[PDB]
Design a protein around this ligand. Structure first.
Ligand SMILES: N[C@@H](CCC(=O)N[C@@H](CSCCN(CCCl)c1ccc(CCCC(=O)O)cc1)C(=O)NCC(=O)O)C(=O)O
Ligand SMILES: N[C@@H](CCC(=O)N[C@@H](CSCCN(CCCl)c1ccc(CCCC(=O)O)cc1)C(=O)NCC(=O)O)C(=O)O
Ligand SMILES: [Ca+2]
Ligand SMILES: [Ca+2]
Ligand SMILES: [Cl-]
Ligand SMILES: [Cl-]
Lengths: 209, 209
């Protein structure tokens, strides 16, 4: 497992998986796809769904951001202690994914006019993750069970990008707020989040956040 | 039965998990939610993400259609023979989910105006699945490896509904065509697709398909 991440110079759908790799002490290569390389058409045509990210783990080539996360989850032991927890881990991640889709649609298709409506709906969209925490060790460990899972990284990223979109959207949610604090303070992750590798990438591709 | 499906009276996002359960010889209870019951609001408020399907495996309550699929996939041994195969199964399922989201958006939000453009784009959206079949034992077995996985049931449902949307769409895709006929002829699944519990539900909820 030498790891490669093939993606545009943005945080987007590689942010969570980079946080996970960094926090887990994994080494990886960034293969940075410029607008020129994409436009030439060869790489795109070679991608299974015509999209990035693309990921290489030794001879295994993957596509789909959530597939990469589950693969890393499965192979690094970040997927709950048993089948019951693995199911709850999926349920969290599929929740994160649904909101990310709504986030991305707002960003890339309807930012100015749509933002009011999005932000009005946001407390209701965040509340389920507070609920999950309230029911797992009083919100003191992780989103599921007593160890970190790939869903924590993806939820973390969703929370961070939403604090940028709507400053203080976590204020009503003490468990969520504390959780962001705790996970962000994990020493290797902390270092990664403060690094120009992360800080100097835009969240999205169109200047909007 | 240990399993309960809680859903609207439609095939929709439950059609794949039902085929999976039937094909695997499992019993489950259908609990049907009517629009009136839904509009009352109390069931909706109790749902983690304000949506159906809801699934019960004993006291384990799940939301998210793909979470249900992955959970049954793990529990019933339909998730590849190893970690590399599990990753490829996720890759298929995430591709299936992406096209399902586009399909659902056509059906409920843009059917009249959008159908022609959608059908125009469809071969390009299906071809990745033909590609995967072509690279796995000549398309003669499953989507991944040599045993059925949860992603097969999902992919089958996606193919079935697209043959309803655009009859003959699989004429361009010999391996996908043979694949649909082959899985549909599996004796338990054949009986299930023939049965009233399947046939007497509409694909979607608004009269369009
Ligand atoms: N289900 C998939 C979704 C994958 C997905 O949506 N990928 C898209 C979205 S990726 C991020 C958006 N994007 C592509 C816009 Cl077409 C993009 C973002 C930033 C840059 C670079 C701009 C920054 C800079 O130049 O400084 C270029 C493209 C993609 O590949 N788009 C390109 C294409 O389809 O040809 C998954 O989860 O991986
Ligand atoms: N990420 C989730 C997505 C789940 C999802 O989109 N579910 C929706 C869509 S479910 C299918 C469409 N639908 C609900 C739209 Cl109101 C629906 C379909 C058929 C009927 C038939 C009613 C017949 C009767 O009442 O007798 C009614 C509603 C839902 O629960 N909507 C209700 C709501 O948000 O209030 C997953 O993958 O499971
Ligand atoms: Ca590089
Ligand atoms: Ca662990
Ligand atoms: Cl994105
Ligand atoms: Cl649906």
């Amino acid at each position: 497992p030498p790891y490669t991440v093939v993606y545009f110079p943005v945080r987007g759908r590689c942010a969570a998986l980079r946080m996970l790799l960094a926090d887990q002490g994994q080494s990886w290569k960034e293969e940075v796809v410029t607008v020129e390389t994409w436009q030439e058409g060869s790489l795109k045509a070679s991608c299974l769904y015509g999209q990035l990210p693309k990921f290489q783990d030794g001879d295994l080539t993957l596509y789909q951001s959530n597939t990469i996360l589950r693969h890393l989850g499965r192979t690094l032991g970040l997927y709950g202690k048993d089948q019951q927890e693995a199911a709850l881990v999926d349920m969290v991640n599929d929740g994160v994914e649904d909101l990310r889709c709504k986030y991305v649609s707002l960003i890339y298709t309807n930012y100015e006019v749509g933002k009011d409506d999005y932000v009005k709906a946001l407390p209701g969209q965040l509340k389920p993750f507070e609920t999950l925490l309230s029911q797992n060790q009083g919100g003191k460990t992780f989103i599921v069970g007593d160890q970190i899972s790939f869903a924590d990284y993806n939820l973390l990223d969703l929370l961070l990008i939403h604090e940028v979109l709507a400053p203080g959207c976590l204020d009503a949610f003490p468990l969520l707020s504390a959780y962001v604090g705790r996970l962000s303070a994990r020493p290797k992750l902390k270092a990664f989040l403060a690094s120009p590798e992360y800080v100097n990438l835009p969240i999205n591709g169109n200047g909007k956040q």
